[PDB]
Amino acid sequence: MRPDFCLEPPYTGPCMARIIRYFYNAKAGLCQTFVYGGCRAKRNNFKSAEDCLRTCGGA
């Protein structure tokens, strides 16, 4: 089992930055990159693929 936040689609947020973050994609089983706006990040938002896989792998 894994946290439900791992199943949420990536959330860019309202800020206008172009920051590379990782999110777990349950459809592929891998952590993918996405553009984060810089504020109000949801939990399926990681600074590294490793952090993401350790938190959401297998969801």
Binding site: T12, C15, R18, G37, C39
Partner: protein, 239 residues
């Protein structure tokens, strides 16, 4: 400050390509690989002002004198960051007080394409309806960033009119502009919103947040420099 050696020509979503080097204070904030994540403005040879949510670190670099990010031959200045001064009052929940200062390791070499923007006085009053300009390499369509620097003219909005849309999300260190057919977008954050003060381009806002789809009919929100300039001056004086 505020006087480009190369004059801009004005007729970011629905903006236009800027005249190369016409916004000399505009810098690109990039990681160690050259990836652009935010914009910023030079306020002097050793300091850059940007947004706090950009999360700049001493591992990132300030790129000055740039126009075409797709041109490897274009001459630019890659400047290292010595220290990052994030306003301690930055609210990560409301996004208020969204400003950060970057102290460069080595001073930038001012020239025809690299110079500073002017800072306003805390008591300056830039009236609603005033036509200002914002620039940056943010998305032009809500997608990859445009290679060449973009610009857009847009009006400042009264807090009353801005709140007609954003309501109580508008805080005291924020100023709105836009909802006029143009919009800042991913990659523009930290960049400048400038208006002329006695003929000199002065930093009135710092790209912060807004429509999650970069809608051109919605007010764009910027960090209000007049409400944060005293903090800027105090930081420079102590460093």
């Amino acid at each position: 400050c505020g006087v480009p050696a190369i004059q801009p020509v004005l007729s970011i979503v629905n903006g236009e390509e800027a005249v190369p080097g016409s916004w000399p204070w505009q810098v690109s904030l990039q990681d160690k690989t050259g990836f652009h994540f935010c914009g910023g403005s030079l306020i002097n040879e050793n300091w850059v002002v940007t947004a706090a949510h950009c999360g700049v670190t001493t591992s990132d670099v300030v790129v000055a004198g740039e126009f075409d990010q797709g041109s490897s031959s274009e001459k630019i200045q890659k400047l290292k960051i010595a220290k990052v001064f994030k306003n301690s009052k930055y609210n990560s929940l409301t996004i208020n007080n969204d400003i950060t200062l970057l102290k460069l390791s080595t001073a930038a070499s001012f020239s025809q394409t690299v110079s500073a923007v002017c800072l306003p006085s805390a008591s300056d009053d830039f009236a609603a309806g005033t036509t200002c300009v914002t620039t940056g390499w943010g998305l032009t369509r809500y997608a990859n960033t445009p290679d060449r620097l973009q610009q857009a003219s847009l009006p400042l909005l009264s807090n009353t009119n801005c709140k007609k849309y954003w309501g109580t999300k508008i805080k005291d260190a924020m100023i709105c502009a836009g909802a006029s057919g143009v919009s800042s977008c991913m990659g523009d954050s930290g960049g400048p919103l400038v208006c002329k003060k006695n003929g000199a381009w002065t930093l009135v806002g710092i790209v912060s947040w807004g429509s999650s789809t970069c809608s051109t009919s919605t007010p764009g929100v910027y960090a209000r420099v007049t409400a944060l300039v005293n903090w800027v001056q105090q930081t420079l004086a102590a460093n």
